């Protein structure tokens, strides 16, 4: 989904990063303790998504 975040503006990228970190990071981390998180690829997917988001905002803005 590289093109999805590539076109987004700085404010939209910040909002996406905020909502992702708030919801998905914990919804996978809290469930990762025990009794939940049947699918394990969600952690890797969210980590890659946040890494891609952080990769942006360094060249789109301030460069």
């Amino acid at each position: 989904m590289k093109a999805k975040e590539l076109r987004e503006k700085s404010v939209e990228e910040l909002n996406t990063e905020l909502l992702n970190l708030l919801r998905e990071q914990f919804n996978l981390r809290m469930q990762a303790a025990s009794g939940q998180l049947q699918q394990s690829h969600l952690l890797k997917q969210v980590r890659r998504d946040v890494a891609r988001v952080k990769t942006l905002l360094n060249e789109k803005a301030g460069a």
Partner: protein, 93 residues
Amino acid sequence: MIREERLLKVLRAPHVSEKASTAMEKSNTIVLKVAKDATKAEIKAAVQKLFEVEVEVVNTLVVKGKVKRHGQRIGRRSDWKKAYVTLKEGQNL
């Protein structure tokens, strides 16, 4: 002001133990494994922002790694910080 991103990147996960289960109702206290530093102010602000609960004081401790020697060379476990959070009246997961 503490950045919400920092608040979200200090709480690792709740710690499951029988002592924690007893404390859930004995004193309305919970145990959470948190980041290495996990300053009381930052973690308290994170808890208030996320769970919308009331906390007056949070205790902190560090658990030393346990040396493990099974078959191969000795091994150590990463040191982790545990926080006892006492909620005033609000009960939440």
